[PDB]
Amino acid sequence: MLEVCIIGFGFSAIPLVRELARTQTEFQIISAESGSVWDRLSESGRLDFSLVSSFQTSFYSFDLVRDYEKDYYPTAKQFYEMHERWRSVYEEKIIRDFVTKIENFKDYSLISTRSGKTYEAKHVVLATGFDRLMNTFLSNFDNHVSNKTFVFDTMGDSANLLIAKLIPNNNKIILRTNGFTALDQEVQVLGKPFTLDQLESPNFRYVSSELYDRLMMSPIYPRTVNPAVSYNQFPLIRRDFSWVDSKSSPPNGLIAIKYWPIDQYYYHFNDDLENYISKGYLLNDIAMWLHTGKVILVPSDTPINFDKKTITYAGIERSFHQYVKGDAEQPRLPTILINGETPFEYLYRDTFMGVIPQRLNNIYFLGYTRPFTGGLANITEMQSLFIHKLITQPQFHQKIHQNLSKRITAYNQHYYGAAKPRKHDHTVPFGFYTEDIARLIGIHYQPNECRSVRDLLFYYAFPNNAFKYRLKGEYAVDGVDELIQKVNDKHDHYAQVFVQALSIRNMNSDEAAEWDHSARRFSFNDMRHKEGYRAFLDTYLKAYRQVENISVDDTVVDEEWNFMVKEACQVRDKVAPNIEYSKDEDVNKGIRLILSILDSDISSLPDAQSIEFIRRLLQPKNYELLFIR
Ligand SMILES: Cc1cc2nc3c(=O)[nH]c(=O)nc-3n(C[C@H](O)[C@H](O)[C@H](O)COP(=O)(O)OP(=O)(O)OC[C@H]3O[C@@H](n4cnc5c(N)ncnc54)[C@H](O)[C@@H]3O)c2cc1C
Ligand SMILES: N[C@@H](Cc1c[nH]c2ccccc12)C(=O)O
Ligand SMILES: N[C@@H](Cc1c[nH]c2ccccc12)C(=O)O
């Protein structure tokens, strides 16, 4: 009897196949001849964009240990080339066919295929990815569409990439949405670039819920009255967060788009602009679009005529060329038959850690958990370790499954509370999820085993990337020691985010929200760093057009749009003139202090009262996770 069958091979399955090979566990992969959206984009030459996620979080530990030299954003070309490199390694273990049905029995499954070939396997892993409504827009994208009006009912990363591509053809963009969370993918800390995933210090949740909440939520919840923040200039960007019923913030189910702020885009790409655009580094600064009026927000309930193709806002009856109805994610699951009869019903919350479904025996889901920030790699590497351990170690399989339904209830209580199921429940802060799996497997760090201040920075401030948990123990990867050293040497041992937590420990949430926004350039949606880049924007559009052989007329002037932008930007035209740094000073001084006591013994530190606090990090009081204990 075949020990393991993996269904679907693109990106998510790679780390699991690697571990099954290492332990010589018998496995077969079944995967469609057709392949993925990445094959659609490759075949049709549309891998001309870049990831919304850092290198560190988007490539597996066993690639990073070889190829990491600096933080950067990989291109769609590089990401796909990496999938193709791993497909080549394992292609001999792949049967090219399409699974149509799985019949699940007490200790095996019967797998049916389009060819008619059937397979028996004791353990079955689904790594088939999602169907996405929006893929047709990216895969069949037309760049000749010019001077047209688009209406989007949802802001997501796909809409934002479409918008980046339309705007340089003088396409006008109306968003008719119930708000959206957008975050600068890259941020300056005392004049040095940090990808946003470098600054989450997630294990601070263990100090307390409230402290972590103040560390994280002021750029997402409308907490500052600072008029430089996009959610004050353009309030139609605010969301209804009344659904959230959890002390764990950011909450599971919160989705964000991650975008190039124009200032960081300029710092990286200004010197070789056309060549960088052609590699797929597209400016996608939604806040700059709102600032310049190349995008407008309108209320959710703004009347539209689907028959005449018209949207009803202020004075002009604007005909729209296309309505984009907004991306949904549905797992590509075959029919699964419980005891080979009863259709399995998929719901993210009714699986443990997005991986283990109830009422199925030895079936695992790999790649259906979505990270709030950073790449999928962080999530699928840790899920792969979890699945490998369940498959190959019956003691671990028994430990997890014995109280499976209780673990799931305890997880849902902790992370969702009494909220009803939502379509985005599958979205998790990457640094909670990786840490959660690491504690389940037993490859976690213990805060009580920190000796030096340097050790506290590593435990609390070093990002909870999957490779963090592959330094030593059961899943160690060779070269992780050198990788961690390199990353620490380039990021000042994450002293800056450690000092952020030290700065806000005594504040309430309004105070921390004010302090967050006291910076000369605060992390996210700082509308003071837009006007100075108006000339560079024109250079950019000219560069984009030249790269893509586009010719449009700005000497042709769209009068009617010029007119609707004024109505859209009334709060901004009122709020912006009220503009005009505690955070910069606090952080600068704190980093000085921390970097001076790097190698000081914690336990022995003498009796401001930040010392008390630093000493208490050996004994955090919010460490309990009832779905693990
Ligand atoms: C436009 C776009 C941009 C993205 N950008 C990023 C990014 O910036 N950073 C990031 O980290 N992630 C990004 N992602 C998300 C993620 O990395 C990709 O979705 C990735 O392809 C997921 O890998 P996967 O292996 O789970 O699924 P896939 O890559 O879709 O591979 C699954 C494979 O299984 C096959 N298959 C499906 N059903 C069956 C079946 N029943 N039988 C047999 N074979 C089957 C499919 O044909 C496919 O080849 C992006 C996704 C998209 C669509
Ligand atoms: N802690 C950093 C970065 C940060 C805050 N909120 C976030 C949400 C997601 C990602 C990063 C962040 C700051 O306060 O600016
Ligand atoms: N364009 C993809 C982006 C995406 C999906 N899942 C992700 C995980 C990590 C980074 C990016 C993504 C989407 O439809 O949403």
The domains of the chain, with CATH numbers, are: 2-131+329-441 (3.50.50.60), 135-327+505-582 (no CATH)
- For ligand 1, whether the C-beta of 334 sits within 6 Å is yes
Candidate of 5, 9, 11, 34 to mutate for ligand 1, largest count of ligand atoms within 8 Å of Cβ: 11
Q: Resolution of the experimental model in angstroms, please? A: 1.9
Residue 487 in 3-state DSSP? helix
Phi and psi (nearest 5°) for 491? -125, 20
Dihedral (CA of 602, 607, 613, 616) sign: positive
End-to-end CA distance of the chain: 34
Chain Cα centroid distance, residue 546: 32
Phi and psi (nearest 5°) for 407? -50, -50
Ligand 1 atom 10: the closest Cα is on which residue?
375
Strand partners, 123: 4
- The set of residues, in sequence order, having a beta carbon less than 8 Å from that of 117 and lying 6+ positions away, is 95, 97
In order of 64, 297, 468, the CA distances from 524 in angstroms are 28, 19, 26
Ligand 1 atom 1: the closest Cα is on which residue?
158
Among candidate residues 508, 494, 502, 492, the one with its CA nearest the CA of residue 464 = 494
- For ligand 1, whether the C-beta of 101 sits within 6 Å is no
Question: Residues 264, 497, 480, CA angle at the centre, nearest 5°?
Answer: 90
Residues in the chain: 629
Whether residue 249 contacts residue 216, with contact meaning beta carbons closer than 8 Å, is answered with yes
C-alpha to C-alpha distance for 336 and 124, rounded to whole angstroms: 11
If you search the block for the tokens 């060779």, which residue do you land on?
478
C-alpha to C-alpha distance for 57 and 79, rounded to whole angstroms: 12
- The set of residues, in sequence order, having a beta carbon less than 8 Å from that of 147 and lying 6+ positions away, is 169, 170, 171, 172, 552, 556, 558
C-alpha to C-alpha distance for 310 and 308, rounded to whole angstroms: 6
Query: What six digits make up the tokens of 444?
Result: 């976690």
Phi and psi (nearest 5°) for 224? -90, 150
The residue type of 460 is: Y
C-alpha to C-alpha distance for 234 and 624, rounded to whole angstroms: 40
How many Cα neighbours within 13 Å face the side chain of 94?
19
How many A from CA of 268 to the centre of ligand 2? 21
Whether residue 189 contacts residue 587, with contact meaning beta carbons closer than 8 Å, is answered with yes
Cβ-defined contacts of 395-399 (< 8 Å, 24+): 396/441
H-type alpha helices, 91-208: 135-139, 157-166
Residue 12 in 3-state DSSP? coil
Query: What six digits make up the tokens of 263?
Result: 């200032």
In order of 18, 26, 280, 362, 596, the CA distances from 392 in angstroms are 13, 10, 41, 11, 46
If you search the block for the tokens 């688009």, which residue do you land on?
150
Query: What six digits make up the tokens of 442?
Result: 């037993």
- The set of residues, in sequence order, having a beta carbon less than 8 Å from that of 610 and lying 6+ positions away, is 502, 505
Nearest 10 degrees: Cα torsion 537, 541, 544, 550: 180
Question: Cβ < 6 Å from ligand 3: which residues?
Answer: 52-53, 132, 134, 156-158, 327, 370-371, 375-376
Strand partners, 124: 5, 363
C-alpha to C-alpha distance for 397 and 352, rounded to whole angstroms: 13
The residue type of 326 is: G
How many A from CA of 225 to the centre of ligand 2? 18
Whether residue 9 contacts residue 126, with contact meaning beta carbons closer than 8 Å, is answered with no
Phi and psi (nearest 5°) for 253? 100, 0
C-alpha to C-alpha distance for 227 and 233, rounded to whole angstroms: 6
Among candidate residues 247, 258, 257, 249, the one with its CA nearest the CA of residue 218 = 249
Instruction: Please state the atom number of ligand 1 nearest to the C-alpha of residue 9.
Output: 33
